[PDB]
A paper describes a structure:
Here, we use human ASNS, a Class II glutamine-dependent amidotransferase that mediates asparagine biosynthesis, as a model system to evaluate whether EM-derived maps can provide insights into conformational changes that might mediate function in multi-site enzymes. As in all other glutamine-dependent enzymes, catalytic turnover requires that ammonia must move through an intramolecular tunnel connecting the active sites. Human ASNS is also of considerable biomedical interest, having been linked to metastatic progression in breast cancer, sarcoma cell proliferation, and decreased effectiveness of clinical treatments for acute lymphoblastic leukemia. Moreover, ASNS variants are strongly correlated with impaired neural development in children, pointing to the importance of gaining an in-depth understanding of how single residue changes might affect activity by altering the conformational preferences and dynamics of the enzyme.
Arg-142 is conserved in mammalian asparagine synthetases, Sequence and structural alignments, however, show that that cognate residue in Escherichia coli AS-B is isoleucine (Ile-143) even though nearby residues are conserved in both homologs. We were able to determine the structure of the R142I variant dimer at 3.35 Å resolution by cryo-EM in order to assess the validity of these MD simulations. As expected, replacing a polar group by a hydrophobic side chain had little impact on the overall structure of the enzyme (0.483 Å RMSD of WT vs. the R142I variant) although structural changes in the tunnel region are observed that will be the subject of future computational analysis. The N-terminal entrance to the tunnel linking the two active sites is open in the EM structure, similar to that seen in the X-ray structure of the C1A AS-B variant bound to glutamine and AMP. When L-aspartate was varied at saturating levels of L-glutamine, but in the absence of ammonia, the kinetics of PPi formation showed 4- and 2-fold reductions in turnover number for the R142I and R142A variants, respectively. In addition, given that the gate to the tunnel is open in the two variants, as seen in the MD simulations and in the cryo-EM structure of the unliganded R142I variant, ammonia trafficking is expected to be maintained at the WT level and so have little impact on steady-state kinetic properties. Replacing the positively charged Arg-142 side chain by the smaller, hydrophobic side chains of isoleucine or alanine, however, clearly alters how the C-terminal synthetase domain in human ASNS responds to different nitrogen sources. More importantly, these calculations raise the possibility of a role for Arg-142 in maintaining the structural integrity of the tunnel after formation of the β-aspartyl-AMP intermediate; this finding may underpin the observed kinetic properties of the R142I variant although additional experiments and simulations will be needed to support this hypothesis.
Residue numbers in the entry:
A (entry chain A): 1 to 50, 54 to 55, 57 to 211, 220 to 464, 476 to 539
B (entry chain B): 1 to 50, 54 to 55, 57 to 81, 83 to 213, 222 to 466, 478 to 539
Write the structure that this text describes.
């Protein structure tokens, strides 16, 4: 789904509908453009994927509450029962209105375990509220003007097109994950920012066994939390698939997903997807996992020409120029296109965030101290809304598909980060040793995968960019891209394409990778 | 309230949204712009006039029915007769409750009120377009041979539309009294299937003295006029009136005030009269207001504003007819004054009396009463272009509403069913039956009931005399081949209309027939 708001508008709302429709790829099934009574300058916009729920949500009990949200709140039945809240509509996000009425904005955002990005408007109290998930899933982009012009969109493609007269420059920036912004609605449609507070994560009480921090009492808790995350991500009326990259995280996610699906009396078989080159070891591992679990495996053979042609599309969708995310997202875009075309699975489960939480990266072997490794992991999790969640989310949503990341749930990630740093660090030369040990006896995935001319894909990209980028431009790039100057030709070409699609807005990224 | 629906659109939808906002003046409170699931090419748009609804009506009992209408029916509270539960607070949902009951022919023939609706049935794969018998609520359709369809309220919301597959699209006013059925092809585009008239009264059997003697007809006419005013009274907005100083406006104002007093209405009636300084029409309006006690607001509009409002009047009225523009200048000014310095939205006016009651001066020179009846029926059929068109385009242009009490289905059917001798002028005075009907109720002073019948045309001609050169009137036969203006005023109106609406000048076939 795609949310969109235009609180404050000196221009007409018809010239500003093209920007709203620029994110129509998120849901190509419905679209509603609606204004707000008394504040006709401010409007809304929603896109839906897959009967008679739509947005904005205006309920009879709260006539002054206007909510435009996209994502999934998993603990809505566990809270509509704890506090009786009659829901007029079948929308998952209706509980946000009730929680806001009951206890304001601070308590309506800390009890939404799940992924979400919402815009809330209160005419009675004359206030506007924004929100994003604590890890950056379900992104949000905000554009603010000193006059009081406010814009919010799911992606940045819906804000750069927007025209605001009486102000030459409009600043479009990604909404900081884990934050809520309270702004005051002036009686002319404009807004004035009143506060911006980070609510961090939470460890919800209404969600078994959590004795302490012993080795045998940690693996059991990790298993319980992972299974609970998969179970709570299961809830949906749409088909669920999986992306088998061949790694430990994807294999564990697929195995647990299959087990919980079988426990949920689900009729459709699970569809696991793998993308790679011919006879690649990753594809072999994915096929081994699929055969071990018995899932409908769909292998996609990567051809370099398709990636070369789709470089521009993936740069446009991802809205970034970082080399690593583009290289890792070209294949994800292709596999999402294949899933949309040849299969009927929309909900996609991936093991994104495991490497940045379970110390899964190679350079973590060179951490001077476990505390440094923990700090690096926390920093990666904070900056996850720009590198991997962006790659796993924008590319997935570019084809009308939904993303689920069980490794990025609040409870399991919080418990893993609360573990002593001596346990998260690699122990016997293998990264993420604790996660591998926690599933030794469950027999979820084969043992050889549990504990585990060279990669001839980046060579094609390197040679293509080298042929397409001149050395004189690279020398000139110091005075051509003053902010985040590319150091290689690949970065230069990615930046060139990104500026061609988005001119002058390159502040969305400030670093690349690898703090060895 | 304005409605704007697209079917079979191929040139996206965001670039086609700016055409809908051209009718935002009808309702400036809210605005919706929806789509059709499975038919993304099709889209809907509603402009609401003022708490929680919009009119892409989808009722959970009929998930495949999407209705958009801009009007108000007076027979919905048929709900008691049919025991039809209504999910929403709108009075158009019953249309769906009727469409499943008996189709579209029976639904549109039992709607007592003004309406122009578009309905989409996905299950039956059809689109239905409807308009009232006298066309009080406007409706304009633009259809291409490819399958494109654009149904709006006014025409200003369709001339902006773009067809990337056809150079020219024909925007024509939907006929007043027809229902149109179109087959919904899978590609969103719609072909043309059927278009049948439904005419007039068929709802009076299933909802609420024979003879033609002079007393019985008078009693029946009084009863029907009172019933029309009473059924038009129902609304949540304030009710005003336009005191033109004539018989029809005075009668409507008196009956409206009497019913409002019978309705325990707290707010006083607001009667508005626009005219020149010290004019007989304004004096008559003041006399009527004093006799009935309504709060009277008088506007002494000067020639400068009327001249400066000619462009906007022609833009809103979408016509180049001389008389329509002449009356529409004053109607537009009085509507602007009403919106600006008054909280009254619903307006009552006698638009349809001079045609249905044969109250024009030239009706005296009638070759026969049958000829007069035929002329009156011809005027009623073309009423959606001259008088109703102005009374709607100059009212909805300021976020107001028009409630014509004289063009009631039962009242018109009974008046037109009378012998032609009674309708014709009796003693050299037109509308004799209407005047005799209310001669005992003491609604309005006798000096105004009788005595049948302000220099604004002269300044209009003076302004448009040094604006159309004598050379520009010589080539009018080669500059405006269709409906060539015979006067300089008509040439000015036509040039303004062409500047606002280029090429699409076939909406008005004739100009106006005084005989």
């Amino acid at each position: 789904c795609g949310i969109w708001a235009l609180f404050g508008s000196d221009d007409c709302l018809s010239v500003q509908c093209l920007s709203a429709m620029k994110i129509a790829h998120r849901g190509p099934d419905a679209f509603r453009f609606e204004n707000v009574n008394g504040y006709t300058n401010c409007c809304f916009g929603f896109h839906r994927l897959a009967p008679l729920g739509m947005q904005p949500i205006r309920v009879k009990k709260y006539p002054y509450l206007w909510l435009c949200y996209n994502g999934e709140i998993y603990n809505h039945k566990k809270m509509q029962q704890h506090f009786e809240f009659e829901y007029q509509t079948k929308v998952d996000g209706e509980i946000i209105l009730h929680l806001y009425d009951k206890g304001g904005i601070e308590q309506t955002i800390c009890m939404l375990d799940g992924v979400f990005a919402f815009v809330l408007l209160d005419t009675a109290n004359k206030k506007v509220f924004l929100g994003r998930d604590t890890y950056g899933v379900i992104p949000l982009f905000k554009a603010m003007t000193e006059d009081g012009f406010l814009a919010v969109c799911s992606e940045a493609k819906g804000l750069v097109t927007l025209k605001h007269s009486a102000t030459p420059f409009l600043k479009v920036e990604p909404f900081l994950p884990g934050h809520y912004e309270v702004l005051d609605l002036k009686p002319n449609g404009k807004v004035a920012s009143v506060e911006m507070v980070k609510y961090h994560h939470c460890r919800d009480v209404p969600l078994k066994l959590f004795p302490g921090f012993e080795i045998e009492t940690v693996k059991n808790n990790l298993r319980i939390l992972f299974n609970n995350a998969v179970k709570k991500r299961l809830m949906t009326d749409r088909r669920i698939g999986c992306l088998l990259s061949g790694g430990l995280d994807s294999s564990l996610v697929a195995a647990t997903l299959l087990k919980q699906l079988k426990e949920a009396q689900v009729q459709y078989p699970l569809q696991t997807f793998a993308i790679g080159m011919e006879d690649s070891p990753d594809l072999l591992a994915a096929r081994k996992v699929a055969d071990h679990i018995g899932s409908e495996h769909y292998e996609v053979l990567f051809n370099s020409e398709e990636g070369i042609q789709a470089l521009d599309e993936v740069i446009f969708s991802l809205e970034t120029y970082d080399i690593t995310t583009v290289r890792a997202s070209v294949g994800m875009y292709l596999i999402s296109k294949y899933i949309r075309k040849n299969t009927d699975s929309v909900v996609i489960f991936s093991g994104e965030g495991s490497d940045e939480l379970t110390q899964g990266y190679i350079y973590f072997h060179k951490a001077p101290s476990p505390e440094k490794a923990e700090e690096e992991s926390e920093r990666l999790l904070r900056e996850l809304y720009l590198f991997d969640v962006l790659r796993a989310d924008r590319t997935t949503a570019a084809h009308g598909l939904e993303l689920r990341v069980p490794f990025l749930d609040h409870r399991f990630s919080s418990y893993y980060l609360s573990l002593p740093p001596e346990m998260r660090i690699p122990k016997n030369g293998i990264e993420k040793h604790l996660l591998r040990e926690t599933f030794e006896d469950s027999n979820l995935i084969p043992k050889e995968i549990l504990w585990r001319v060279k990669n001839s894909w980046f060579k094609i990209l390197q040679e293509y960019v080298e042929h397409q980028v001149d050395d004189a431009m690279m020398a000139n790039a110091a005075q051509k891209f003053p902010f985040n100057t590319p150091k290689t030709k690949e970065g230069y070409y990615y930046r060139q394409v990104f500026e061609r699609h988005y001119p002058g807005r390159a502040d969305w990224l400030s670093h690349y990778w690898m703090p060895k």
